[PDB]
Design a protein around this ligand. Structure first.
Ligand SMILES: O=C(O)[C@H]1O[C@@H](O)[C@H](O)[C@@H](O)[C@@H]1O
Length: 306
């Protein structure tokens, strides 16, 4: 059984490395009965195009941002809301515990032919722009690229900007020409997708912390034996933990490289951004009241139950 794994990120990126190591484990443990090949750098298309391919079995596995899964499986949008997690460490507790399992299961048990197996870390997303944004007010009227999810367009509009949905690969040229004034992402993406060449101001809003599911086509999943399925579950969960260490290293390295390239990291009070997005959490969070209560209550400890 052959697995093609699609990635939007370039070779060497922390997700890519963790995933190729996971694939090596699959090959070794199955004595070659499962083979694995990585297709990085967006060679198999945009994240939305790849998810479509996974649904019909043309691509066997991928990792994508949860941001673009929302339009396919609405119930995952609980993790896509602005400031749903208080910080990066809080998100990690969630994806490692019971609520993380529940949300993976909402993808798997959906009618959309995907099996969700683990969560990769993509840090926190902050706004980078061609001109400095030092306050909520400075964002007014700016065209900021977001991922293709109505939630993020509403979010950016609530912050007084103009959210423009675009595929990952379209951002570089749109920035170069001023078709957009900025975008929002973590430091490794800002660096490794070369967006810093056009945007030298990075405002640390941390407005989203979007986990990234690793998914398999359910068509492919159903061709595995139960023992192979257990192997896949095991090594996917191991990859969630391995990628965390790679992520922390890469994020810190990327921050330093970006500063050396002349990117200014601008600290801001998050409160005005939190307040501006209350309407978005009210709109999209109405049906997630219980989950939000449970998420908010995860704090000092590291329990599984939440
Ligand atoms: O915003 C984006 O397009 C990209 O953001 C990065 O942070 C994610 O790791 C990647 O999966 C997304 O495709």
């Amino acid at each position: 059984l052959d697995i093609k794994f699609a990635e939007i990120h370039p070779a060497g990126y922390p997700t890519v490395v963790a995933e190729q190591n996971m694939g090596k484990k699959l090959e070794q443990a199955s004595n070659g009965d499962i083979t694995f090949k990585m297709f990085a750098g967006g060679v198999l298309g945009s994240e939305k195009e790849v998810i479509e391919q996974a649904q019909i079995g043309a691509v066997q596995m991928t990792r994508v941002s949860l941001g673009i899964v929302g339009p396919v499986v609405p119930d995952v949008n609980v993790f896509n809301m602005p400031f749903v997690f208080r910080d990066h460490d809080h998100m990690r507790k969630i994806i490692d515990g019971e609520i993380g399992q529940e949300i993976l299961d909402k993808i798997t048990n959906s009618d959309f032919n995907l099996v969700a197996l683990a969560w990769m870390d993509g840090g926190s997303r902050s706004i980078y722009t061609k001109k400095p944004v030092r306050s909520l007010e400075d964002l007014k009227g700016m065209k900021i690229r977001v991922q293709g999810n109505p939630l993020f367009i509403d979010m950016m509009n609530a912050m007084g900007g103009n959210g423009i949905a675009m595929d990952t690969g379209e951002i570089f040229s749109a920035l170069q020409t001023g078709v957009i004034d900025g975008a929002e992402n973590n430091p490794p993406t800002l660096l490794e997708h070369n967006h810093f060449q056009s945007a030298k101001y990075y405002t640390l809003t941390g407005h989203l912390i979007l986990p990234e599911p690793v998914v398999m086509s359910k068509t492919t999943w159903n061709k595995l034996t139960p023992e192979q399925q257990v192997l896949v579950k095991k090594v996917a969960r191991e990859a969630q933990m391995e990628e965390r260490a790679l992520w922390d290293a890469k994020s810190a390295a990327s921050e330093e490289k970006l500063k050396a390239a002349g990117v200014e990291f601008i600290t801001v009070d998050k409160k005005p951004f939190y307040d501006a997005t209350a309407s978005v959490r009210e709109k999209y969070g109405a049906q997630y009241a219980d989950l939000m209560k449970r998420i908010d209550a995860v704090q000092a400890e590291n329990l599984y139950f939440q």
